[PDB]
Symmetry: C3
Subunit: 170 residues, 3 copies
């Protein structure tokens, strides 16, 4: 007879058998329960880059609420973005963050999450009018996602008061 | 002495003891962590059925974002819905989907979830004005939920640009 | 040789080794999966207290959707709130709830969650105009959170139709 062996996330050390727990995901308070890691509200500025229908950049003030392995993004723009077409792509690369939090892992999506486009709420003012769209993002790599949204009209224009609301599973 | 026996989700095969993991819920990367299953953004059309305060139907364009065991619904209507009263019930039965994704399990709520009404965001235009409500749905069975919302006024009318935003735990 | 010992959330009773599961977080259906606890939609009234930029109180009609260890709050006000400044703090203490649900644990945030400010969506009408803000709350203790939001203008005024939308991890 072979004895008993323990496969991850089960482990054994000095006769004690344990469940190894990601504290951002789970903990025990006797029974197996939700995360024990402290939540963070991160505040930083993110320079987004127009990558299609714009060669412009725009500063976003970002509040990243990290709770368990959910990071929720609340972004607001200062400035006008120059658009050239009826659709624009705005790229969000982790290198274009100033500040940059130490828990950078809270801004990288899981491999599971990265596999699909995800919903992004977009609003902005163009020609004094408030536009609002159900847009979509997709990660191109683990550090970079691009959102795609309508500009409100055609040709060259300036969109202002850009808000972005979305979230990722990390 | 009886020995040791392992209760689900613990299991033993050839001396190796494991935690069986639903990959839509959890995985191990050494420690027990969040889901490893790939996210999906599903796109299909859903014919909703007025079931009270309407005998009409309306085509919805649905984006179902499946991430872990969360499915988030973003629906937008093409067409007018005929209403007859100040409140309407709109039924969403899985059989009235065209396309219909192969991972249909992503559109069935958990028994836990099904036990309560859940929040649904509803908006639409009636008489040129944009209405918006915090509405509620409830599953009648595991395949069928009905949302209940105000129509914006009284008697016969046509509501347009119907949006529905909600999510289910599957 | 010492034998094998089982650390929480693993446990052993009469030779049977188990994973103890918080049913609000997890269950087994063979593999380890999401919560099995029934969801609740709670409905109660909550008297909020102006604690800075107001010495007033305001009745909120609250719908608390409890699903797993997520509680989502949908609040709507009846009445005017008297404000005195350009920013207001509104306190939500569990003692000021009437009704008060028996599953009060669904309205206490986790120690993890409590550690950070969290996003709160606020809207209201002032001077006939509809204001809307991305606001923030923070728990001062496990029973009491305070939201902080702009009033829409300055000096004494009355804000009406106050809505509050937020959620907590419990």
């Amino acid at each position: 007879s072979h004895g008993l062996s323990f496969s991850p996330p089960l482990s054994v050390a000095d006769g004690v058998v344990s469940l190894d727990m990601d504290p951002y995901f789970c903990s025990q308070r006797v029974s197996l329960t939700s995360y024990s890691a402290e939540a963070q509200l991160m505040q930083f500025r993110w320079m987004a880059r127009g990558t299609n229908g714009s060669s412009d950049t725009i500063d976003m003030t970002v509040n990243a609420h990290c709770h368990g392995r959910r990071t929720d993004y609340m972004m607001s723009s200062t400035g006008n973005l120059t658009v050239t077409s009826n659709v624009v792509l705005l790229t969000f690369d982790l290198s274009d963050i100033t500040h940059i939090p130490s828990d950078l892992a809270r801004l990288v999506p899981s491999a599971g999450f990265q596999a699909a486009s995800f919903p992004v709420d977009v609003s902005f003012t163009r020609d004094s009018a408030t536009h609002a769209y159900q847009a979509y993002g997709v990660y191109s790599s683990s550090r970079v996602f691009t959102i795609t949204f309508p500009t409100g009209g055609d040709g060259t224009a300036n969109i202002r008061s850009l808000t972005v609301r979305t979230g990722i599973d990390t």
